[PDB]
Scaffold this active site. Structure first.
Site, PDB file in Angstrom:
ATOM      1  N   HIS A  61     -14.995   1.642  -5.777  1.00 45.45           N
ATOM      2  CA  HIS A  61     -13.601   1.526  -5.382  1.00 45.45           C
ATOM      3  C   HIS A  61     -13.375   0.275  -4.562  1.00 45.45           C
ATOM      4  O   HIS A  61     -12.276  -0.261  -4.507  1.00 45.45           O
ATOM      5  CB  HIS A  61     -13.208   2.752  -4.565  1.00 45.45           C
ATOM      6  CG  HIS A  61     -11.739   2.974  -4.489  1.00 45.45           C
ATOM      7  ND1 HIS A  61     -10.889   2.654  -5.522  1.00 45.45           N
ATOM      8  CD2 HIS A  61     -10.967   3.499  -3.513  1.00 45.45           C
ATOM      9  CE1 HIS A  61      -9.651   2.960  -5.183  1.00 45.45           C
ATOM     10  NE2 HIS A  61      -9.669   3.468  -3.964  1.00 45.45           N
ATOM     11  N   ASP A  93     -16.165   3.543 -10.118  1.00 47.99           N
ATOM     12  CA  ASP A  93     -15.333   4.019  -9.036  1.00 47.99           C
ATOM     13  C   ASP A  93     -15.361   5.547  -8.974  1.00 47.99           C
ATOM     14  O   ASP A  93     -14.690   6.214  -9.745  1.00 47.99           O
ATOM     15  CB  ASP A  93     -13.907   3.538  -9.303  1.00 47.99           C
ATOM     16  CG  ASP A  93     -12.975   3.750  -8.132  1.00 47.99           C
ATOM     17  OD1 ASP A  93     -13.069   4.810  -7.482  1.00 47.99           O
ATOM     18  OD2 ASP A  93     -12.119   2.865  -7.888  1.00 47.99           O
ATOM     19  N   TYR A 129       0.848  -1.185   0.000  1.00 51.87           N
ATOM     20  CA  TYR A 129       0.000   0.000   0.000  1.00 51.87           C
ATOM     21  C   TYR A 129       0.892   1.247   0.000  1.00 51.87           C
ATOM     22  O   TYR A 129       0.862   2.036  -0.930  1.00 51.87           O
ATOM     23  CB  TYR A 129      -1.011  -0.006   1.156  1.00 51.87           C
ATOM     24  CG  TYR A 129      -1.926   1.199   1.127  1.00 51.87           C
ATOM     25  CD1 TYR A 129      -3.068   1.222   0.331  1.00 51.87           C
ATOM     26  CD2 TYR A 129      -1.628   2.332   1.866  1.00 51.87           C
ATOM     27  CE1 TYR A 129      -3.889   2.340   0.295  1.00 51.87           C
ATOM     28  CE2 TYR A 129      -2.438   3.438   1.834  1.00 51.87           C
ATOM     29  CZ  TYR A 129      -3.561   3.440   1.054  1.00 51.87           C
ATOM     30  OH  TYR A 129      -4.346   4.567   1.050  1.00 51.87           O
ATOM     31  N   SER A 161      -5.635   0.695  -4.930  1.00 44.12           N
ATOM     32  CA  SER A 161      -5.521   2.151  -4.735  1.00 44.12           C
ATOM     33  C   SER A 161      -4.089   2.748  -4.768  1.00 44.12           C
ATOM     34  O   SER A 161      -3.398   2.632  -5.781  1.00 44.12           O
ATOM     35  CB  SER A 161      -6.305   2.612  -3.512  1.00 44.12           C
ATOM     36  OG  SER A 161      -6.785   3.915  -3.729  1.00 44.12           O
ATOM     37  N   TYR A 162      -3.656   3.415  -3.699  1.00 40.21           N
ATOM     38  CA  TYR A 162      -2.271   3.885  -3.632  1.00 40.21           C
ATOM     39  C   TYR A 162      -1.317   2.722  -3.855  1.00 40.21           C
ATOM     40  O   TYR A 162      -0.286   2.869  -4.482  1.00 40.21           O
ATOM     41  CB  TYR A 162      -1.956   4.534  -2.289  1.00 40.21           C
ATOM     42  CG  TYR A 162      -0.736   5.430  -2.304  1.00 40.21           C
ATOM     43  CD1 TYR A 162      -0.868   6.814  -2.248  1.00 40.21           C
ATOM     44  CD2 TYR A 162       0.540   4.900  -2.373  1.00 40.21           C
ATOM     45  CE1 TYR A 162       0.230   7.639  -2.262  1.00 40.21           C
ATOM     46  CE2 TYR A 162       1.653   5.718  -2.385  1.00 40.21           C
ATOM     47  CZ  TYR A 162       1.495   7.091  -2.333  1.00 40.21           C
ATOM     48  OH  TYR A 162       2.601   7.921  -2.354  1.00 40.21           O
TER      49      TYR A 162
END
Ligand SMILES: *[C@@H]1O[C@H](CO)[C@@H](O[C@@H]2O[C@H](CO)[C@@H](O[C@@H]3O[C@H](CO)[C@@H](O)[C@H](O)[C@@H]3O)[C@H](O)[C@H]2NC(C)=O)[C@H](O)[C@H]1NC(C)=O
Ligand SMILES: *[C@@H]1O[C@H](CO)[C@@H](O[C@@H]2O[C@H](CO)[C@@H](O)[C@H](O)[C@H]2NC(C)=O)[C@H](O)[C@H]1NC(C)=O
Ligand SMILES: *[C@@H]1O[C@H](CO)[C@@H](O[C@@H]2O[C@H](CO)[C@@H](O)[C@H](O)[C@H]2NC(C)=O)[C@H](O)[C@H]1NC(C)=O
Ligand SMILES: *[C@@H]1O[C@H](CO)[C@@H](O)[C@H](O)[C@H]1NC(C)=O
Ligand SMILES: *[C@@H]1O[C@H](CO)[C@@H](O)[C@H](O)[C@H]1NC(C)=O
Ligand SMILES: *[C@@H]1O[C@H](CO)[C@@H](O)[C@H](O)[C@H]1NC(C)=O
Ligand SMILES: *[C@@H]1O[C@H](CO)[C@@H](O)[C@H](O)[C@H]1NC(C)=O
Ligand SMILES: *[C@@H]1O[C@H](CO)[C@@H](O)[C@H](O)[C@H]1NC(C)=O
Length: 728
Positions: free
Chosen positions: A702, A670, A509, A592-593
């Site tokens: 998301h 998303d 992450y 995500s990140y």
């Protein structure tokens, strides 16, 4: 030599963790939901007595999504017809049931399609939001009072949050705050008038002929932001003769000169309120303390009760500025603050004195202030054994800061190193939730003499089950780069033979203030990969990660997609050096990140990684939202940080992908990280002739969290992994 933890086990949920969630309703009483009945338990002794039988709403004739019992136990609110909106948010239908009368209230109901509802914190008052306007019910069965007339879809939001405040500031749909006895109702008003729309298709059911275009005001880095105004209404002097009067409390002058946000709302006493504001350049924030003026009816905010908070090396707070906990008289307050060494510790403030005094110190951090009595402050930190990944409950003596005692470290040392706490109404009793390394344990304690009266839930049944499966082990440790410790965790397959060479999957992450290396016990697809596919799954917390002070956390300030990427690579190397890793077989994956970092790594050219999966990745920071992104990057203008914005995109590394296998996955709906970001990735990759795997999920957000979609995505990722490692 039993059977393994299988993908089907993970997806079908065959081995389930039991919980025990209660709700304190007084200083010594809480509510639990044993066998679908609501019971009230009395902690002072042991007794338990039925508060509401499961049969009560057999007659409702509605699927009941949620309930909420009023503070005085007189009324219960029934939420049905839930229809989802974003994350934390929705629309629903509400019915109120009078517990005395044992009757549904049928006169003056809460309108269909209501956005939000809260009880006052002590009576049975009601505040709800409907078409973006606030409405208050004093007695549940009489006409609501309309507080605002100004709400307008996608433009003006009274008492609920717009997209960006919801996701990145308050972490809630609500933007109401009752005063302690429900006399005042404070609220925020958001204005998205000049905020650009993100638009995207929603396909819905097979029978919808023309797709729906969803439009959401969403500020991207640098774009025009929403504006905020703050109000307080006195709910005791409402009337049907007269539109309510909301007193507007205005932001400090240091905020008014430019774009700002309202980042915290905390009540100090029945008549004192504290507001925290933050400049759009999240370098600088101010706390304002406003007293109610019994004569004029307004709110007085004396300057020199203001408290300025600045960061010289990044942003204020971990994500936002931290909230204060006032003493009972509201003339002093405690607040987590980063000290001279850059470690976050508890600070003790006087409402009229600029300076503050630290009550804890050390190379470890205070996670959260949990409860405050006159004698003691109860807080959670990671001091124990110097592990940033652990959590324990401490209490500190307010008359002697040297007298700090640890309420959880000795409770069960080998099994419990991750605690969270829920306190009774005056910190008389508290429940302790243990999350790992062993199975979660839930206990009850009285804070008078710290005695542990009861074991609420121990997951014996689950323990029993897991005896008869080949479970993986977990190692949690650190390595040393540049005279600094960086923790990692590994999930290790059963019968782990230190001599053989295992394929490795980095779970990433790496976002600012994150922490993937902890002591929490989990049953997830890393469990499946380790147990069944003999594959080591690893996470590492490099630069810009949480709970280890600002030297590490602010390391990536103004420059995302640099240090944390480098460090995730460095950790794969360091893992190779350990000698049980088959370095012709390291994957990397992240959502995500983490999808951003995965992509950045695969495009690095490092030649360390054979393949990766990126789910819903950020690809370019000018695509993500203003609040989050600018916190770490400033504005993408060339007067500010445009160079680092443009230097740090996935698409500019497209060429390097020719050396790796890549799976790219994104939900079409998303609203957080837009499909746009991946559309741009796959476009750049096509444009340089790189082959890759891709997968869209029609109508997922998301979370890709819907049942079918979730088992589908993990199955697909499983096949990609097993294939990339050339395993059966
Ligand atoms: C939410 O935000 C919008 C955007 O600012 C607000 O509307 C704008 O309000 C300004 C004044 O604050 C208006 O400016 C005025 O316009 C008239 C002629 O249009 C001019 O002669 C006045 O001297 C002044 O320049 C502007 O028209 C208006 N813009 C838009 C886009 O409608 C809106 O009032 C805000 N709502 C709130 C805070 O409740
Ligand atoms: C409270 O405020 C509202 C909003 O301005 C008033 O509602 C308007 O009243 C005017 C004048 O009667 C009408 O022409 C509009 O149709 C009304 N707008 C709406 C949306 O209702 C309302 O009259 C006020 N009520 C009190 C008690 O003064
Ligand atoms: C909640 O607090 C409010 C405000 O502090 C209390 O109301 C005040 O009480 C004093 C003395 O009774 C009055 O003279 C003030 O005018 C009141 N303030 C208001 C109503 O604006 C109130 O007692 C508290 N509520 C409960 C249920 O005790
Ligand atoms: C409802 O409550 C009764 C009495 O405690 C219990 O025996 C029964 O199983 C409950 N019904 C369900 C389906 O949860
Ligand atoms: C628990 O028992 C005590 C003492 O016998 C009694 O006074 C009290 O009412 C009981 N509490 C509840 C919630 O029944
Ligand atoms: C909500 O909508 C339903 C279905 O159209 C209707 O029967 C009912 O009257 C509504 N309830 C309220 C509280 O207005
Ligand atoms: C952030 O605030 C500092 C002072 O705290 C200011 O001097 C600086 O120019 C601002 N932005 C940055 C880091 O460029
Ligand atoms: C240690 O030092 C080198 C050179 O200053 C630097 O580039 C590297 O990133 C540092 N490693 C970490 C993880 O801080």
């Amino acid at each position: 030599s039993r059977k393994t933890y299988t993908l089907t086990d993970y997806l079908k949920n065959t081995y389930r963790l039991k919980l025990y969630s209660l709700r304190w309703i007084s200083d010594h009483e809480y509510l639990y939901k044993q066998e679908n009945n609501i019971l009230v338990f009395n902690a002072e002794y042991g007794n338990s007595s039925v508060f509401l039988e499961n049969s009560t709403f057999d007659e409702f004739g509605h699927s009941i999504n949620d309930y909420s019992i009023s503070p005085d136990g007189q009324f219960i609110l029934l939420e049905y017809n839930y229809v989802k909106q974003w994350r934390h948010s929705y629309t629903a239908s509400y019915d109120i049931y009078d517990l005395n009368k044992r009757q549904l209230i049928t006169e003056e109901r809460i309108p269909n399609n209501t956005q939000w509802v809260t009880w006052s914190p002590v009576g049975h008052k009601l505040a709800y939001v409907w078409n973006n306007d606030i409405y208050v019910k004093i007695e549940p069965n009489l006409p609501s009072y309309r507080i605002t007339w100004t709400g307008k879809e996608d433009i003006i939001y009274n008492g609920i949050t717009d997209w960006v405040y919801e996701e990145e500031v308050f972490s809630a749909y609500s933007a109401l705050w009752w005063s302690p006895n429900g006399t005042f109702l404070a609220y925020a008003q958001f204005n998205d008038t000049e905020v650009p729309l993100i638009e995207y298709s929603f396909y819905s059911d097979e029978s919808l002929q023309y797709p729906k275009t969803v439009r959401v005001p969403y500020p991207k880095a640098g774009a025009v932001n929403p504006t905020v105004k703050f109000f307080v209404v006195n709910t005791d002097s409402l009337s049907s003769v007269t539109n309510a009067t909301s007193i507007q409390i205005t932001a400090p002058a240091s905020m008014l000169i430019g774009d700002h946000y309202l980042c915290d709302v905390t009540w100090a006493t029945q008549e004192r309120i504290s507001l925290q504001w933050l400049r759009r350049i999240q370098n600088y924030s101010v706390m304002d303390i406003c007293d109610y003026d019994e004569s004029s009816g307004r709110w007085n905010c004396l300057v020199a009760r203001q408290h300025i908070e600045m960061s010289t090396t990044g942003w204020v707070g971990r994500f936002r500025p931290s909230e204060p906990h006032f003493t009972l008289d509201g003339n002093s307050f405690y607040k987590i603050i980063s000290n001279e060494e850059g470690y976050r510790h508890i600070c003790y403030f006087q409402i009229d004195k600029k300076d503050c005094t630290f009550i804890t110190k050390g190379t470890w951090e205070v996670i959260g202030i949990e409860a405050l009595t006159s004698d003691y402050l109860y807080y959670i930190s990671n001091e124990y054994k110097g592990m940033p990944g652990g959590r324990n409950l401490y209490k500190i003596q307010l008359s002697d800061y040297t007298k700090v005692t640890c309420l959880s470290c000795e409770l069960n040392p080998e099994r419990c190193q991750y605690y969270s706490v829920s306190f009774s109404k005056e910190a008389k009793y508290y429940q302790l939730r243990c999350s790992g390394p062993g199975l979660p344990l839930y206990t009850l304690h009285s804070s008078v003499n710290d005695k542990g009266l009861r074991v609420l839930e121990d997951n014996s049944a689950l323990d029993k089950m897991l005896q008869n499966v080949q479970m993986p082990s977990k190692k949690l440790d650190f390595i040393i780069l540049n005279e600094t410790k960086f923790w990692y965790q590994m999930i290790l397959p059963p019968h782990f033979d230190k001599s053989k060479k295992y394929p490795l999957l980095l779970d990433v992450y790496a976002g600012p203030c994150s922490q993937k290396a902890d002591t929490v016990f989990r049953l997830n697809w890393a469990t499946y990969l380790a147990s069944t596919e003999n594959i080591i799954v690893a996470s590492f917390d490099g630069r810009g990660s949480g709970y280890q002070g600002d030297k590490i956390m602010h390391a990536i300030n103004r420059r995302l997609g640099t240090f944390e990427v480098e460090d995730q690579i460095e950790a794969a190397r360091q893992f190779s050096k350990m000698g049980f890793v088959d370095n012709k077989r390291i994957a990397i994956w992240g959502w995500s990140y983490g999808g951003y970092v995965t992509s950045m790594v695969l495009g690095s050219g490092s030649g360390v990684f054979k393949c990766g999966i990126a789910v819903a990745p950020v690809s370019r920071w000018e695509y993500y939202d203003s609040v989050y992104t600018e916190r770490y990057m400033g504005l993408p203008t060339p007067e500010d940080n445009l160079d680092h914005y443009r230097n740090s995109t996935v698409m500019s590394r497209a060429e390097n992908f020719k050396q790796v296998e890549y799976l790219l996955i994104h939900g079409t709906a998303d609203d957080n990280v837009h499909f746009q970001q991946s559309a741009q990735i796959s476009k750049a990759l096509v444009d340089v002739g790189v082959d890759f795997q891709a997968m869209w999920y029609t109508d997922e957000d998301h979370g890709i969290a819907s049942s079918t979609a979730h088992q589908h995505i993990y199955t697909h990722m499983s096949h990609f992994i097993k294939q990339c490692f050339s395993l059966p």
